[PDB]
Amino acid sequence: RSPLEKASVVSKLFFSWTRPILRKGYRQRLELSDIYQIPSVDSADNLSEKLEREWDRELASKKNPKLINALRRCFFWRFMFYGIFLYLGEVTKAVQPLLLGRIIASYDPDNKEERSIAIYLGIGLCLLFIVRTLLLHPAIFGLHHIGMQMRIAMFSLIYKKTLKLSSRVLDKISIGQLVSLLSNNLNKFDEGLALAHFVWIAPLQVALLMGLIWELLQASAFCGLGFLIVLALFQAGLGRMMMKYRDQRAGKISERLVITSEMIENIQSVKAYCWEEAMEKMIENLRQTELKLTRKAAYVRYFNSSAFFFSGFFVVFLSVLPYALIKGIILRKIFTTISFCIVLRMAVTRQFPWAVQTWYDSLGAINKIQDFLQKQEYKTLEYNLTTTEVVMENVTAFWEGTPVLKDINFKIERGQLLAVAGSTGAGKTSLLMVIMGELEPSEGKIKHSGRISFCSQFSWIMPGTIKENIIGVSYDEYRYRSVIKACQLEEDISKFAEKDNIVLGEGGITLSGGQRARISLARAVYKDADLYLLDSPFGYLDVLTEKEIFESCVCKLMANKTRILVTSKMEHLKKADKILILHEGSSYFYGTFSELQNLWNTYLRYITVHKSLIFVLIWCLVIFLAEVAASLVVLWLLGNTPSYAVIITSTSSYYVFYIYVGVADTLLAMGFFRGLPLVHTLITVSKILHHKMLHSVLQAPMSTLNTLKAGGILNRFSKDIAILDDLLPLTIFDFIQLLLIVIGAIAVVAVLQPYIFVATVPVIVAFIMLRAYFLQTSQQLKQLESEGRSPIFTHLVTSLKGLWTLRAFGRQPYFETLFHKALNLHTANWFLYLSTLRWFQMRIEMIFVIFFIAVTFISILTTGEGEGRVGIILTLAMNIMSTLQWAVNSSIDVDSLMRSVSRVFKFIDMPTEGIWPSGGQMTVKDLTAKYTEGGNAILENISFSISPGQRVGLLGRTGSGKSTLLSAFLRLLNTEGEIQIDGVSWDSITLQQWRKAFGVIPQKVFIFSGTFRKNLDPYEQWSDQEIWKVADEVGLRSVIEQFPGKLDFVLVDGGCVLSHGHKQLMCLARSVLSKAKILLLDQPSAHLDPVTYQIIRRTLKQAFADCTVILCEHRIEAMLECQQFLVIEENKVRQYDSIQK
Ligand SMILES: Cc1nn(C)cc1S(=O)(=O)NC(=O)c1ccc(-n2ccc(OCC(C)(C)C(F)(F)F)n2)nc1N1C[C@@H](C)CC1(C)C
Ligand SMILES: Nc1ncnc2c1ncn2[C@@H]1O[C@H](COP(=O)(O)OP(=O)(O)OP(=O)(O)O)[C@@H](O)[C@H]1O
Ligand SMILES: Nc1ncnc2c1ncn2[C@@H]1O[C@H](COP(=O)(O)OP(=O)(O)OP(=O)(O)O)[C@@H](O)[C@H]1O
Ligand SMILES: CC(C)CCC[C@@H](C)[C@H]1CC[C@H]2[C@@H]3CC=C4C[C@@H](O)CC[C@]4(C)[C@H]3CC[C@]12C
Ligand SMILES: [Mg+2]
Ligand SMILES: [Mg+2]
């Protein structure tokens, strides 16, 4: 099936099997209908199985486990098999000046030997071109193919280890680091392997060339060699400098990215707090520090790169001078030694340093992967046969100076229900950890059963269909329909737009809090297990639905299976068989309930965004014309000037033009007065574009941001911005340098002889018409290839949030299969892109060769009795086109990189956003709310009024629009209608003033990784003594003094150290500093303890005594301080009065 394997030998050599896609993609848009199936050789299954079979031996049979050893047991003898052909193709390039140099000398009538035999040289030279064409490109493509296999084999091997990481390893560092570990060699590995052989080929080339140069310059060859040794040492020193600055700034990039992710995820809170300006400055300082090291690395890379161009004269003159002074040198050997040194400079100044740097990076990546592969593993050994009767006795455990649980025991017969209770932080969840084997007890003795179904408190939602999130692997209509219509999903499912096949994102951002709880609960009960562990599923569910689910699912469906339920509700305990209460990590009570009572134009915009890049580009052009003007006059002065060191004859004067073209690269090289300004100015363009994009995202309508993918926002700040910092500044410089040399060399030799320009027209046009044909298909495949990587990273992310559920039930093989399917999709697009690019770069050389054979035979045949003007003109023209072929291939990379610039620009063009509070009486009239444009209408024609200072209760069934109303107050979503506060209409004042009057307290409090004082007020409006004054009422004094630093402690990881109640207090104090008037609470009482619960009770009655509060609760017992009640149901709001109803 795979066209590569079905291809014949002759077609496979020329890459002819890429013909169908090039024609198909030239006249229409491509899709996943003609993307060819991947070859069987590089499927993820075959590569991973082979490599792991060699690696596991290396860590068990040999003394020292090294990944590099196992890698060479799989890919070494195929690596060397392509190295010999790569070497033989380079040797062919070194011996060309012998055949070509004699042909050029054959135009001189003063020669006899070359005239006698030129046809034989022409035939041999033609064969030399054909052999080299068909010897390099297959070898380079082979090395790319092996580099792809290494990348796939290691990524699949990494994922398998990730599924086995111990629980204690995950809690230190993961997810954010793990994804970054895979994004450093996504394309640098395969493409950065074809030049690893030049570490030994280049020394073999220098020895060969130095022997050939010894024939010309008897003993002065070494004088030029010593200059190249110094250049090699000089370039090597820059390598240590580049790596030092690269690895020194690695920690700054991670610091920016992790903070940027926090801002993106909680963007809805950032808008509500009116914190747009503060966050822009916070990132701005981080960019300013990073940019200092970025420029240093770019200056070092400039001097390392600009050594090939600035050595084309100092290596020739230094070796020709001693010989010319001792004895008179003729022009023919001056051109010949120039031709040899062109290859000599490329090998030692451009190929060898690149090869060495690659080995530093290839070995560094393998050692980084090697260390990760040997972390502590999750223990899979567990009891198999126990008759499904879990028992514990004298069990102790630690999460590290205090035991988490001590001497806890129970005994559950099959079909019983155990109710676990306690307080916040008592270890309810940690008790379930030991039962799954996630936390091996230090000195305990516990019995494990078979498959165990775990329902974590954290809601897990994975990409795909709603039913696909429930059924798992096997489907069953009768079972599915019963589970769906037992968890009260009947109504909500057949509501949205598409019944049940709705496609969800990672984490289910578009779903209600309680709807996600039911889906996670429904998945746990669907699958058959020996025992079920329900870790507090009723957190988000209101009382009315809580009873219905408890009576129809927990007590009805699984009435005859052992089940452990964690719950604090008093009524749920009496319906259980045995109860276990944890006081503080220790069993205070154990027993039954009965005994409990007693106890294009993109390029134009990229350049002019700075308005300073214009002047630098003009400066480079003006100097370029000055050097060209000098080159013209000096060649014209030598054109009429009348034995010296240089023996020049009338019949051999044409060598002047050949010599100039051979050294034109040096004469037109950009020095440090032009290169450094250009590199500096291109970098600050990236800084400018980042600022506009970061400014645009924080000031965009929420509806626009919801239409995009989950992780897509961060990907532009992670990949696209990073490309503008490293790849574009140097790739553009290299492209401009090559193009400028070609224009300069072709404009000076053509004015004296107005025929070279004409003879070189066909070559230029052929390279251009081929480029326009290939780019149509190449760009389309690149877009498909780049988009194919997001599903791969999403699978890795979602398989970590639900990792504890995976290992409990034993579904690792299923997720390994899913990960392999994601890789094969990315491999299919990448392989086709790599093959068509090889097709283009092979045909571009084949067009050059066919013109060379045409020129060579004409030049030899046209040469008559003397001279021959056609031979001189044509042969010189083809020497100019050698650089153009290089320049055309360099332009492909620039076009590929400008796709990233276009993606940056479209984010900037997003649309923008659209004592005054006397009493706080708002009036709502005809309010319609919708999350997305044209999706639905959650609330329709809402009308109600609030008395100033009243406490308004808010109730309703989960998934009705309870939280949509609170967001519509801030118009954080597309709304129509009029909401007036004390007579001031919804659109009489700017949006900034409107949002400042609301003290919203979300379910997830936004706390970024920064100083304690910075979180309270990023704008730095209030002094210490004013902050302490506010903390006196909210009870934050003792909370903050626990830490070593007062107002100076550095919170990390979302404030992980702070408990849920402590973050509620911090959010409450934040609204007091800004002096809010209308509060918006949203289900704070999920798992709160009375220690902090009573603090909010006082503050809403002491500081906000006269301020309106919208208490959003799920039970009437807590709502004993409200007068007015709002009830949401069937897209309607209806106000009420005192409890008598
Ligand atoms: C058709 C077709 N369309 N597509 C998309 C693929 C195919 S193809 O693969 O069938 N053929 C071509 O791709 C193809 C094959 C060979 C050549 N050659 C040009 C000089 C040359 O040298 C011959 C010589 C004997 C000297 C030696 F070989 F030694 F160099 N050969 N040119 C080819 N092309 C036809 C156009 C599509 C583009 C272009 C000009 C590059
Ligand atoms: N992964 C972990 N690493 C370190 N300490 C942990 C970890 N998980 C829990 N702990 C600690 O163990 C103790 C008990 O954890 P916790 O989940 O287990 O109890 P809980 O009663 O279930 O809490 P809650 O009802 O609020 O979820 C606490 O001191 C907590 O900080
Ligand atoms: N970001 C969103 N984009 C689109 N639709 C959404 C989004 N968030 C919620 N919805 C939809 O709005 C409806 C109600 O959402 P939800 O916040 O509003 O109800 P709720 O009563 O506040 O939830 P709960 O009581 O469980 O916390 C549901 O149909 C849900 O799918
Ligand atoms: C092993 C690899 C690197 C190839 C071989 C390298 C050495 C042995 C080769 C490369 C070029 C060769 C030289 C090329 C030209 C001449 C001039 C001739 O009048 C005497 C031999 C002499 C001086 C050759 C001696 C051997 C030589 C120096
Ligand atoms: Mg818990
Ligand atoms: Mg809600």
Author numbering: 3 to 402, 437 to 507, 509 to 636, 846 to 888, 902 to 1173, 1203 to 1429
According to the publication:
CFTR belongs to the ATP-binding cassette (ABC) transporter family but functions as an ATP-gated anion channel. The structure of wild type (WT) CFTR shows that F508 resides on the surface of NBD1, where it makes extensive interactions with the cytosolic region of TM helix 11 and intracellular loop 4 (8, 17).
The TMDs of elexacaftor-bound Δ508 CFTR closely resemble those of full-length CFTR in the phosphorylated, ATP-bound conformation, but the NBDs are very different. Elexacaftor partially, when used alone, and fully, when combined with a type I corrector, rectified interdomain assembly defects in Δ508 CFTR.
